Design a protein around this nucleic acid. Structure first.
Ligand SMILES: [Mg+2]
Length: 1036
RNA sequence: GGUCACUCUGCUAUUUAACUUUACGUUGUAGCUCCCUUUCUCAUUUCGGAAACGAAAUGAGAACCGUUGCUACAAUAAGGCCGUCUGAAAAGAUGUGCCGCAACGCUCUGCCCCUUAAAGCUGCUUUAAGGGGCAUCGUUUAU
DNA sequence: TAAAATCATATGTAAAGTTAAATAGCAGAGTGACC
DNA sequence: ATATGATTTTA
C-alpha cells in the first residue's frame, strides 16, 4: 500500500486533513493528499434553542392545563352552573376587572362571575415561588392604588417595569379573600374549593425527581458498572483526606519528606475532631520548627497556613443538623455507622425532594433523625470513583499506601478501566459519554474523514491531531498564572464567607451564582452600578430585588463570562431589556446618566478588561467545544484504532501553538488570509509536527525564554527569531504546500487558480522545478467538501405574529411602538388618512428630530381633539407591511413569515426548469406543494405542477448543484432559493470572498438553464458523482 | 535528566446538557376608552318655494369599519397524542397529562452511490452477494 | 417583457433557581512512552 | 445566517 501520516486540524465546524508519506525511518518525505471537510450548518446553540422552545412549550401547556382545571373546579363546587360556559369551555360574560374585584373582595360580596374571575386571575398570574431549599392588605390593592393612581398601568411593560409579587404574597391574598368573602356570605367559600384553588396556585413540579441525577451521573473509573460516589459521603471524604494526607510534603531547609506514620496518625482524626483542620493548626500539632514549609501552599503576603487543607464538610453538616435538632451532643462524636453516612449522603445527592429522599432512607435511619436531616441538608458534586472501589482503596491508604499503590494492588494499575480494542476503522463515538451535540458532530465528522482516508489509502501509520493545549510555559509565566488564580480563589472565599455571614439560615452552602452575586457586590462597592443606590445585601434572594444583568445582552453577545455581568436592581435590569449600557443610557449625547454610569464603572474594583466591555458602543466564539473534541479524539484514537507506526504511542496530540510556531518557522505565516482551504494547510503542518519538535519547542520556550507565538528570543535587546533550529520537512516546503492547498502559487494570491489535474500538475512542476516528487498520482486539486443537511424539521415560522385580517390584499399589519416608528414606517401607518392630524403630528416630530424615533418620541405623544384639548396617549400604531405569503398561526388568528425552507423540488418541462419551495410547516401539515415559483406574481398565480412536468430531483441545503448558463457554468453547493425571484444561491466550496458576494453566487437563474443537475460528494472532496432522482419524494 | 500522555485530589477560568418556575412581547376576541372615514335619524339655521316637500351647512345621537390607551380572556411554533373514572355504544368526567426547531446511528424501511460475479443486449438491463452515504427509519425520548 | 442578477431590510426578551458532564490552566501524588 | 420584497440589468 503506502505509509503515511495523517494530520488533523479539527474545529467546531471544519476538519482539515492531510497525508504525508514517511519512510522506514518515519520522516516525512511526500505530501500525498489533503482536503477540507466543512460540516457546519447555517449560523447560543441549535440545541439550546430547542431546549428553550421545549421549556416554554411546557410552561404554556401547564398554565393552560391548570386554568382548565380551575374552571372545572369552579363548575364542580357549584360556583358556575354550565349556563356560564360555552362550546369552548370558557366562561361567558367573565368580567375583565380582576384587579378591582380582588380589591373589592376585601370589602363586599362578589358575584359568582366576579369571584371566578378573581380566582382565575390569581392562578394565571401566580408569581414566583422560591426554589432554594431553606396601599396594603393585598398585592392587588397595592397594585391598584400606587401604580394606577400613579402609573397609568397595572401590568409590567417593556420599558416600564413596575411590580414584583411573590407567590406567597398572592397566597396570602387568596387566603384573606376567602376569609373576607366568608364574612360576606358568598356560598362559594367551600373547604374543597379553597384546597383546590390554593393547590392549583402553589403547586409546581420538582426540578429534579427520581432518576434525573442518575441519568446524568457518570460511572466509576475502576469498576464501570458502578456509579460515581458523592463527595458528601464518609467514604469519599475519607478518600479525599487520605489522598491529601499521604501526598503532603514538608519542604525542609533543602530536603523534602513525606509525613511520618506517627505524624499521619497525629493528623488522621483531626478533621473529624474539629470544624476544619487548617495548615497552621496541623503545623502546631506536628512540631515543625519554623524552617519547614509545605510543598504546595502559596506563602505570599497573607496568612497562607490559615487556608483550610481539610474540612469534613458532610461529617460536620450531619453532626450540626442533629445537634441543632437536639439529637446529638456537640461535644460527642457523630453516632452513625459509616455505611449510614454514605447512604444519607448518596440519598441527598441523588435525590432532592423530601419524598424521594425518605423513600430511600426511612427503613435505614430513624424517623427523628431523618426529620432532622431533611431539614438542614443540601449535598452535591460526586467524586470520580464509586463507593465500592473506594471501600476497597481507602483501607490501603489508611495503611500509608499511595493512591497508585493501592489502585495497583487492587485493580492492577491506577490508570483505571480502559477499553482498548483496535480496529482498522475507528469505531463510532459512544455518544453516551458526550452530552454536547456540537462536539459529538465534530467528532463524528472527524471519524467519517478518518475512515474515508482508511477506505481509500489503507491504515495510517500515525495520526497527528491539533489540540487546544498550550506549550509548557516558563517558570515565571505559570507562577504569574498561579498568582492570578490564587487571587481569584481568595475573592471567592471572601464572597462565600460574606454570604455565610449574612445568611446563616441557608441550607447547604453557597452556590456559584451566590458567590457571583457577592463578589460583584464587593467589586461594585455595594451599589447598583446603573442607578447608584445601595444594595440591601440582606435581601439578595428576594426574587426581583437584584438581578445579575448580562451588561452586553445574551441575545446579542452570547456571553456569560464574568466580565459581562453586573449586579443591578431587578427593575433596572428589566427596563434595560436587551440594550447595552451605552444604548440604555444613550451615551451618544452624553446623557446626564451616561456620564454617571461611566464614572461608576471607572471607580469600581472591576478589572480594566471588564470595564472596557461594559461600555462598548460597538459591534461589527466557542473554543471550549474545540478543545473537548480534540482531547477526546486523541484519547479515542489511541485507545481504539489500528496504527502502523513503529512505537507504542502512535497518536500525537499537538496544539495550535506548535502549529503556529512551525508555520512561522517554515514561512507560512499567513496574516488574515482565512478561507476554508487554510484548514488543509494547518493539517499538513500537523502531519509534519513530531514529538521531538514538541519537546524541543517546549524546551526553548520554558528554559530558553522563547515567546510561544512569534517564535522570537531577546538577549542585549537583540530580538532574534529562532527559525534555524526547526528545519522544514523538505527544502521548498512552503511553496509546494501553498500550491497544493490553495491552487495558486505562494507568493501571489492574485493568480487564477489551477482548477484541474493538468493545470495544477503543470503549475507545480513549473514553479518548484527542482523537486520532482511534488507531482505524482494523487495531486488532484483541493475542492472543499461540505456536509449535506437533508433534515426535514426546523423552525416552522418566524416568532412575530402579524395581523392577517387583510391578507387577501397582500398586507400584514403589525403595531409598531413610536420609539421605533421611523419615518418610512409612518407612511405605511394604517390610519394615515383616517387620522390625518395624527399622521401630520407624527411626521412633525420625526422631521424635528432628524428621523430618530427614540429622541422624537421620548416626550409622550398624545392625540388632540378638534378643540385643541389633550386626549389619549399614543405609544404604538398599527403599520402596514407587505405580505405575499405566510403561515397561519395562533388558532388561525395571525400570520407569520416563513423561517426554514426544508427543500426545493426541481422539475423540467420543455427544457425549462421550475422550482417548488417546501417549508417546515408544510411538513408538519403534510402538505406537498403544487405550485412552482413565478417571479412577478404571488403564489396563486404560480405554475401548477401536474402530469406534464418531469421531476428531476430535490434540493436541500449544501447539496452540490451544477448550473450551466450559456453565459457561464457554475457549480456548487445550494444555499438559498428566492421565492420572489425564483433563483438560487450557491456557495463556492472555498467561500472565496473575491468571487460572488463573500463567496456566494447570489441570484443564479435556472429557468432558461441549459443544464441543471444535482451531484454528491464524499467526506474528502473525492468521488463527485451526479445522481438522478427516480420518483418525487413525499414529505412524510 | 527532560517533555509528553493518562489516573486521582484541591483550585482558577470557561462551556455543555437536562429540569422546574416567573415576568414580559406578539396576534386574535371582548369591555371601558382616543381620534376619525362613511352612512343614517333628529334638531337648529339659512336657501327654495302655490302647497306639501326638497337642498345644503352646523350641532346632538346612533351604526359598520378603521383604530389610540388600560384591563381581561384565548393562542404562543406550524402540528400530533396519552393515562384514570363513567358508560352496550355515542360520547361525557378527569390529570403536579405527554410529544414536536438537536444530534447520533444502519438492527427494520425508504432512498442516493460503488465493487465483484452470472447472464443477456446491440455502454444499458435483471438476478445475486458485498460495501458505503443520507434519511421522512431506529434511538437519546417519555404520560 | 421574461428571466437573471443585484440591493436591501427584517428576524423574540429579561430573570430566578436544582443539577449533572466537559475542557484550558495552576498546584500535589504516581506510571509509562518517548527524546 | 436566511427569507424575501424591491429594484436594476440582461437575453
Ligand atoms: Mg440585561
Amino acid at each position: 500500500s503506502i505509509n503515511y501520516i495523517l494530520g488533523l486540524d479539527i474545529g467546531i465546524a471544519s476538519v482539515g486533513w492531510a497525508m504525508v508519506e514517511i519512510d522506514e525511518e518515519e520522516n516525512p518525505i511526500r505530501l500525498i493528499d489533503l482536503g477540507v471537510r466543512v460540516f457546519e450548518r447555517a449560523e447560543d446553540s441549535l440545541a439550546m434553542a430547542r431546549r428553550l422552545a421545549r421549556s416554554v412549550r411546557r410552561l404554556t401547556r401547564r398554565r393552560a392545563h391548570r386554568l382548565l382545571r380551575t374552571r372545572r373546579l369552579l363548575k364542580r363546587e357549584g360556583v358556575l352552573q354550565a349556563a356560564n360556559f360555552d362550546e369552548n369551555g370558557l366562561i361567558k360574560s367573565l368580567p375583565n376587572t380582576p384587579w378591582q374585584l380582588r380589591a373589592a373582595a376585601l370589602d363586599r360580596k362578589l358575584t359568582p362571575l366576579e369571584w371566578s374571575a378573581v380566582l382565575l386571575h390569581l392562578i394565571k398570574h401566580r408569581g414566583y415561588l422560591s426554589q432554594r431549599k431553606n396601599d396594603f392588605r393585598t398585592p392587588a390593592e397595592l397594585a391598584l392604588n400606587k401604580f394606577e393612581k400613579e402609573s397609568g398601568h397595572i401590568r409590567n411593560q417593556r420599558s416600564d417595569y413596575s411590580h414584583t409579587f411573590s407567590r406567597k404574597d398572592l397566597q396570602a391574598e387568596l387566603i384573606l379573600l376567602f376569609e373576607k368573602q366568608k364574612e360576606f356570605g358568598n356560598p362559594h367559600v367551600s373547604g374543597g374549593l379553597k384546597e383546590g384553588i390554593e393547590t392549583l396556585l402553589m403547586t409546581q413540579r420538582p426540578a429534579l425527581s427520581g432518576d434525573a441525577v442518575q441519568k446524568m451521573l457518570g460511572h466509576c473509573t475502576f469498576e464501570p458498572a458502578e456509579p460515581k460516589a458523592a463527595k458528601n459521603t464518609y467514604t469519599a471524604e475519607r478518600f479525599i483526606w487520605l489522598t491529601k494526607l499521604n501526598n503532603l510534603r514538608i519542604l525542609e531547609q533543602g530536603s523534602e519528606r513525606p509525613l511520618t506514620d506517627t505524624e499521619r496518625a497525629t493528623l488522621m482524626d483531626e478533621p473529624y475532631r474539629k470544624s476544619k483542620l487548617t495548615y497552621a493548626q496541623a503545623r502546631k500539632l506536628l512540631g515543625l520548627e519554623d524552617t519547614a514549609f509545605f510543598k504546595g501552599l502559596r506563602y505570599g503576603k497573607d496568612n497562607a497556613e490559615a487556608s483550610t487543607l481539610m474540612e469534613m464538610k458532610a461529617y460536620h453538616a450531619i453532626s450540626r443538623a442533629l445537634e441543632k435538632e437536639g439529637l446529638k451532643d456537640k461535644k460527642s462524636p457523630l453516632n452513625l455507622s459509616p455505611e449510614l453516612q454514605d447512604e444519607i449522603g448518596t440519598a441527598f445527592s441523588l435525590f432532592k425532594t423530601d419524598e424521594d429522599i425518605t423513600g430511600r432512607l426511612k427503613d435505614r435511619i430513624q424517623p427523628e433523625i431523618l426529620e432532622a436531616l431533611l431539614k438542614h441538608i443540601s449535598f452535591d458534586k460526586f467524586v470520580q470513583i464509586s463507593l465500592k472501589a473506594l471501600r476497597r482503596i481507602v483501607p490501603l491508604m489508611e495503611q500509608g499506601k499511595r493512591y497508585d499503590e493501592a489502585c495497583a494492588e487492587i485493580y492492577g494499575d491506577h490508570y483505571g478501566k480502559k477499553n482498548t480494542e483496535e480496529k482498522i476503522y475507528l469505531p463510532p463515538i459512544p455518544a453516551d459519554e458526550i452530552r454536547n451535540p456540537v462536539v459529538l458532530r465534530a467528532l463524528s465528522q472527524a471519524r467519517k474523514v478518518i475512515n474515508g482516508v482508511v477506505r481509500r489509502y489503507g491504515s495510517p501509520a500515525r495520526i497527528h491531531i491539533e489540540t487546544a493545549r498550550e506549550v509548557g510555559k516558563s517558570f515565571k509565566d505559570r507562577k504569574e498564572i498561579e498568582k492570578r488564580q490564587e487571587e481569584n480563589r481568595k475573592d471567592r472565599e471572601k464572597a462565600a464567607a460574606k454570604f455565610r455571614e449574612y445568611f446563616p439560615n441557608f441550607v447547604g452552602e453557597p452556590k456559584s451564582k451566590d458567590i457571583l452575586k457577592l463578589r460583584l457586590y464587593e467589586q461594585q462597592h455595594g451599589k447598583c452600578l446603573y442607578s447608584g443606590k445601595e444594595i440591601n445585601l440582606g435581601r439578595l434572594n428576594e426574587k426581583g430585588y437584584v438581578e445579575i444583568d448580562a451588561a452586553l445582552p445574551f441575545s446579542r453577545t452570547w456571553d456569560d463570562s464574568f466580565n459581562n455581568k453586573v449586579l443591578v436592581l431587578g427593575s433596572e435590569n428589566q427596563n434595560k431589556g436587551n440594550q447595552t449600557p451605552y444604548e440604555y443610557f444613550n451615551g451618544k449625547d452624553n446623557s446626564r446618566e451616561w456620564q454617571e454610569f461611566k464614572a461608576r464603572v471607572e471607580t469600581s474594583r472591576f478589572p480594566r478588561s471588564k470595564k472596557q466591555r461594559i461600555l462598548l458602543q460597538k459591534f461589527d466564539r466557542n473554543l471550549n467545544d474545540t478543545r473537548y473534541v480534540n482531547r477526546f479524539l486523541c484519547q479515542f484514537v489511541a485507545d481504539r484504532m489500528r496504527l502502523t507506526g513503529k512505537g507504542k504511542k502512535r497518536v500525537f496530540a499537538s496544539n495550535g501553538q506548535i502549529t503556529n510556531l512551525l508555520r512561522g518557522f517554515w514561512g507560512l505565516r499567513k496574516v488574515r488570509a482565512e478561507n476554508d482551504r487554510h484548514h488543509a494547510l494547518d493539517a499538513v503542518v500537523v502531519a509534519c509536527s513530531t514529538v521531538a519538535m514538541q519537546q524541543k519547542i517546549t524546551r526553548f520556550v520554558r528554559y530558553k525564554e522563547m515567546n510561544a507565538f512569534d517564535g522570537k528570543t531577546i538577549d542585549t535587546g537583540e530580538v532574534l527569531h529562532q527559525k534555524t533550529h526547526f528545519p522544514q520537512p523538505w527544502e521548498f516546503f512552503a511553496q509546494e504546500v501553498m500550491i497544493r492547498v490553495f491552487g495558486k502559487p505562494d507568493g501571489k494570491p492574485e493568480f487564477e487558480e489551477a482548477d484541474t489535474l493538468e493545470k495544477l500538475r503543470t503549475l507545480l512542476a513549473e514553479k518548484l522545478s527542482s523537486r520532482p516528487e511534488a507531482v505524482h498520482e494523487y495531486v488532484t486539486p483541493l475542492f472543499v467538501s461540505r456536509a449535506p443537511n437533508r433534515k426535514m424539521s426546523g423552525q416552522g415560522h418566524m416568532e412575530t405574529v402579524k395581523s392577517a385580517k387583510r391578507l387577501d390584499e397582500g398586507v400584514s399589519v403589525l403595531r409598531v411602538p413610536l420609539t421605533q416608528l421611523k419615518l418610512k414606517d409612518l407612511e405605511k401607518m394604517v390610519n394615515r388618512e383616517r387620522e390625518p392630524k395624527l399622521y401630520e403630528a407624527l411626521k412633525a416630530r420625526l422631521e424635528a428630530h432628524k428621523d430618530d424615533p427614540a429622541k422624537a418620541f421620548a416626550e409622550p405623544f398624545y392625540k388632540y381633539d378638534k378643540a385643541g384639548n389633550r386626549t389619549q396617549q399614543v405609544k404604538a400604531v398599527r403599520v402596514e407591511q407587505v405580505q405575499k405569503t405566510g403561515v397561519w398561526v395562533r388558532n388561525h388568528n395571525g400570520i407569520a413569515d416563513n423561517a426554514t425552507m426544508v427543500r426545493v423540488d426541481v422539475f423540467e418541462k420543455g427544457d425549462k426548469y421550475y422550482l417548488v419551495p417546501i417549508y417546515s410547516w408544510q411538513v408538519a401539515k403534510g402538505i406537498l406543494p403544487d405550485r412552482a415559483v413565478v417571479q412577478g406574481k404571488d403564489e396563486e398565480d404560480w405554475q401548477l405542477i401536474d402530469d406534464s412536468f418531469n421531476f428531476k430531483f430535490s434540493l436541500h441545503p449544501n447539496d452540490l448543484v451544477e448550473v450551466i448558463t450559456k453565459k457561464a457554468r457554475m457549480f456548487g453547493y445550494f444555499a438559498s432559493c428566492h421565492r420572489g425571484t425564483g433563483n438560487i444561491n450557491i456557495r463556492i466550496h472555498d467561500l472565496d470572498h473575491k468571487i460572488g458576494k463573500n463567496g456566494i453566487l447570489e441570484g443564479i437563474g435556472v429557468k432558461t438553464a441549459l443544464s441543471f443537475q444535482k451531484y454528491q460528494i464524499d467526506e474528502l472532496g473525492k468521488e463527485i458523482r451526479p445522481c438522478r432522482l427516480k420518483k418525487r419524494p413525499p414529505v412524510r
